Amino acid sequence: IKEVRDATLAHKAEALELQRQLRRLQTQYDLLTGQSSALIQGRRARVAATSAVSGQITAIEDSLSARNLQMNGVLGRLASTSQELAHYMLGAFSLLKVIESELQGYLSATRSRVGRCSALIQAASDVQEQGAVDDRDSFLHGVRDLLSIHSNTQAGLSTYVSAPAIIQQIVALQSDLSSLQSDLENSLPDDRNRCINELCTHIQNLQQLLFASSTTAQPILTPWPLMKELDEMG
Amino acid sequence: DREAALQERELAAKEVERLRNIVRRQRKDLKARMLEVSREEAERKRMLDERANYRHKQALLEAYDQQCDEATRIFAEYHKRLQVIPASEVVVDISNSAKDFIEKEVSAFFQSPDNSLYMLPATPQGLARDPSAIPSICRISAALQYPAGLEGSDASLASVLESLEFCLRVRGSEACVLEDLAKAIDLVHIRQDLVESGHSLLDHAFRAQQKYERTTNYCLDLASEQENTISDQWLPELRTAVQN
Amino acid sequence: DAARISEVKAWLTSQFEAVGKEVPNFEYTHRSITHLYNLATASQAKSQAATIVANDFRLKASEYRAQAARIREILESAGMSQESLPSNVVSSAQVLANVANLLNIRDTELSSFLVAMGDISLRKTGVEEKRAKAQKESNALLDYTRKAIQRLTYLKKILAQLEDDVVPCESQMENWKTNLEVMAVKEE
Amino acid sequence: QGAAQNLPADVNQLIDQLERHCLAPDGSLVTKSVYSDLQLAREEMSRERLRYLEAMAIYCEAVAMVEEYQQAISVANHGGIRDVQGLYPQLGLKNSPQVYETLEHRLVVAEAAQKLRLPLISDGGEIHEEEIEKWLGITPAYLSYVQLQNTISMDMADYQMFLAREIEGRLKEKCDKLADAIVDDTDSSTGNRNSSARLPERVKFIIEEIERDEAALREDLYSADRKFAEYYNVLEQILGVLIKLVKDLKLEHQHKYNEMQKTWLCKRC
Structure with a gap:
């Protein structure tokens, strides 16, 4: 009777074990929901904030857009002074010097524009960027170069494939990881466990017929004539 | 008796599914909610940069205000006094204005959507310089900037690989991704090593199943045909005696 | 084996004490050379995997330091709390994330709550149940081995004699075929 | 299968020392190859951990709470009758991290310029790489040393109090609820404050298992x-x-x- 109780209660233990797992789950889901839920309203708050910033950038962009022309005017008015000199006290030369200081702070644009030109080429090489980055990304390829050890024939050869790897070796990352993943999910256990039972059927049929049936027939059907004819031998 | 033990199985065998099933159905919904907030808390980030840089532009506006207020102040009185060799330097300084003109216009046109795209490494200036972080973008930042790779193609080179490792991200959606960056390539090897475990037993187990379903069937088949024959022969062995 | 002799010659420069290890293998490897090559190939892969990972984390550590000191201004940007800093902010921020800091808190800005409960459970709850359910068969595999083992002993209990009995069986039978021709003449 | 069992037994002879003796190569000597540095980096992080995420675990609230005034702005326009006096008390709970925002115009540029390289003076050997690049990329931002003052003009009414309300309160619960649902598992009654400071070991029992127990x-x-x-x-x-x-x-x-x-x-x- 104890054999069944264990079998039942052992599954009950599994139930009790799983019971903990459920109570281990719901409590955090609200906190997982809540903070996210607060974020969702944060979108709506951000929906306004997205308009808020637009109403901000515009109000400021239109200012510098009105002043810069005024700034440009004073230089364009400074040209008139140059044209006035062309038509022909010292502090006008300190004025010129401070305008030169503006060139220094003006160049900040130049350091940015070249940066702006950085994007203007960092975008142009669009799908090629992986190859150009492989020059300063070899670390990432090595991962595959380690994965290439799954392909010993391609171990050394994979070194030079790093260039088109990000778009081409991707499949090796996919096929390999996905296969050994998928193999893990429903081949590593399933096929192995499935295969195993077949050996169990092999002990089965051999036992059922070749051992059990063969030893169930012969030793019972055989003895009778052995004693009967020897009976006449007496 | 038997029914009483069966009932003890019954109480177990009605909740057993309920625990795992309710848990695992939530499990998949939980997973989405994690990512499904990530892309929108990301919107906060991509939004945050809008705030940051534009706030800097507000600062810049205040800054260039502070470079024009005195600058625009100092010229006039000297201009007014004349309005009411050194010519050459002014003239070449006039040529400086001519290029300044359009290049003050860009002061505004900087924030044309072009810089809205240059904002990708810019607002976090530490991520900007290629000669400082062009390898770092692909080590430290890749785990972070992954989802925008579907829109910003530059990061895709670090994303699509992960996007094909998306099972790896599922198990480490937020922070565990940074460690499998190292461990995963071994993990697959270990899994490869595990399927090799099947190889290390299938290498000779296959021959067994191959051996047996041939060798076993012979014995099964031959024994059958033998048994069906000798069966009709043991009875004669008595027929030789029943009269004797 | 030609592959191992190549890379072992490179490992050999460092396996100086292991000679007392290798020398005993060469007395038994004949049935395991390929195994040790399979071990050799995977292990050699782990090495270069280790080498890359050393660089990966080291730089990943040096840059946490940079970005760390970047955000530390949250403390000083609230510099009016320097006197009360340790009692309120450091105490809480450490006594929770300190152990989780190395591997579990890097994304507290987007996943603080997400990882601690959901993802952390996603691992532990993912592994515990699957193993436990896998253990329900496995501890039945202990059963299936236990019954199988006793089947072997119980089976061998009868094969303890049957495997020995065939030699008696062959001799106690083949004597008859020698006389059979003398038997074959009495049937007349 | 008499011979078939001798084979693994024969293999077991050298495989035995492959375990007791040769595991050190794969698990102990590799330190001679690279695994010392890897563990030094792993141990290095164990010091980066103490340095880095202390700010992250609270930074996540600065840019999150500071949103609560961003919504306030638009409403506080036609709520303009109040915006000013609504500023100081309310921000004490909802909008203190406003200071980050009102100073983001500089600190986001200053954090990388001074603080990002200043956890300790040991970074002095890298101050030069940061400066030679920041001295150019930051040129547009350097002209903003007067805007910072103007924002500081009235926010000074804020840099005297918020320690007591949102710093005092917001984090007080912050650690707990996050700690709770890990001790609710089997020791719920002690999760309030008792098993809180004990949480790092309690969670470490889960973090460590995520590497040791998986292994x-x-x-x-x-x-x-x-x-x-x-x-x-x-x-x-x-x-x-x-x-x-x-x-x-x-x-x-x-x-x-x-x-x-x-x-x-x-x-x-």
Whole structure:
């Protein structure tokens, strides 16, 4: 009777074990929901904030857009002074010097524009960027170069494939990881466990017929004539 | 008796599914909610940069205000006094204005959507310089900037690989991704090593199943045909005696 | 084996004490050379995997330091709390994330709550149940081995004699075929 | 399967020392190769951890709470009758991190310029790489040293109090609820404040298992592989002797016994 109780209660233990797992789950889901839920309203708050910033950038962009022309005017008015000199006290030369200081702070644009030109080429090489980055990304390829050890024939050869790897070796990352993943999910256990039972059927049929049936027939059907004819031998 | 033990199985065998099933159905919904907030808390980030840089532009506006207020102040009185060799330097300084003109216009046109795209490494200036972080973008930042790779193609080179490792991200959606960056390539090897475990037993187990379903069937088949024959022969062995 | 002799010659420069290890293998490897090559190939892969990972984390550590000191201004940007800093902010921020800091808190800005409960459970709850359910068969595999083992002993209990009995069986039978021709003449 | 069991036994002879002795190569000598630096980086992080995420675990609230005034702005326009006096008390709970925002125009540029390289003066050897690049990329931002003052003008009314309300309160609960649902598992009653400071060990028991227990599981499932294999041998054993038994003895010897005896039983025949 104890054999069944264990079998039942052992599954009950599994139930009790799983019971903990459920109570281990719901409590955090609200906190997982809540903070996210607060974020969702944060979108709506951000929906306004997205308009808020637009109403901000515009109000400021239109200012510098009105002043810069005024700034440009004073230089364009400074040209008139140059044209006035062309038509022909010292502090006008300190004025010129401070305008030169503006060139220094003006160049900040130049350091940015070249940066702006950085994007203007960092975008142009669009799908090629992986190859150009492989020059300063070899670390990432090595991962595959380690994965290439799954392909010993391609171990050394994979070194030079790093260039088109990000778009081409991707499949090796996919096929390999996905296969050994998928193999893990429903081949590593399933096929192995499935295969195993077949050996169990092999002990089965051999036992059922070749051992059990063969030893169930012969030793019972055989003895009778052995004693009967020897009976006449007496 | 038997029914009483069966009932003890019954109480177990009605909740057993309920625990795992309710848990695992939530499990998949939980997973989405994690990512499904990530892309929108990301919107906060991509939004945050809008705030940051534009706030800097507000600062810049205040800054260039502070470079024009005195600058625009100092010229006039000297201009007014004349309005009411050194010519050459002014003239070449006039040529400086001519290029300044359009290049003050860009002061505004900087924030044309072009810089809205240059904002990708810019607002976090530490991520900007290629000669400082062009390898770092692909080590430290890749785990972070992954989802925008579907829109910003530059990061895709670090994303699509992960996007094909998306099972790896599922198990480490937020922070565990940074460690499998190292461990995963071994993990697959270990899994490869595990399927090799099947190889290390299938290498000779296959021959067994191959051996047996041939060798076993012979014995099964031959024994059958033998048994069906000798069966009709043991009875004669008595027929030789029943009269004797 | 030609592959191992190549890379072992490179490992050999460092396996100086292991000679007392290798020398005993060469007395038994004949049935395991390929195994040790399979071990050799995977292990050699782990090495270069280790080498890359050393660089990966080291730089990943040096840059946490940079970005760390970047955000530390949250403390000083609230510099009016320097006197009360340790009692309120450091105490809480450490006594929770300190152990989780190395591997579990890097994304507290987007996943603080997400990882601690959901993802952390996603691992532990993912592994515990699957193993436990896998253990329900496995501890039945202990059963299936236990019954199988006793089947072997119980089976061998009868094969303890049957495997020995065939030699008696062959001799106690083949004597008859020698006389059979003398038997074959009495049937007349 | 007598010979088939000698093979793994023969393999077991050298594989034994492959375990007791040669595991050190793969797990101990690799430190000589690279695994020292890897663990030094791993141990290095164990000091980066103490430095880095202390700000992250609170930074996540600065840019999150500071949103609560961003919504306030638009409403506080037609709420403009209040915006100013609504500023100081309310921000004490909802909008203190406003200071980050009102100073983001500089600190986001200053954090990388001064603080990002200043956890300690040991970074002095890298101050030069940061400056030579920041001195150019930051040129547009450097002209903003007067805007910072103007924002500081009225926010000064804020840099005296918020320690007591949102710093005092917001984090007070912050650690707990996050700590709670890990001790609610089996020790719920002690999760309030008791098992809180004990949480790092309690969670470490889960964090560590995520590396040690997964590795233990790897051998559990890998041992289960061995269990199948050793399970395979015994079944491969029993049948290996049953399959031979029928052909060597039953079909061969057991048959050749009785059908020969019959000619003796049925000899007079």
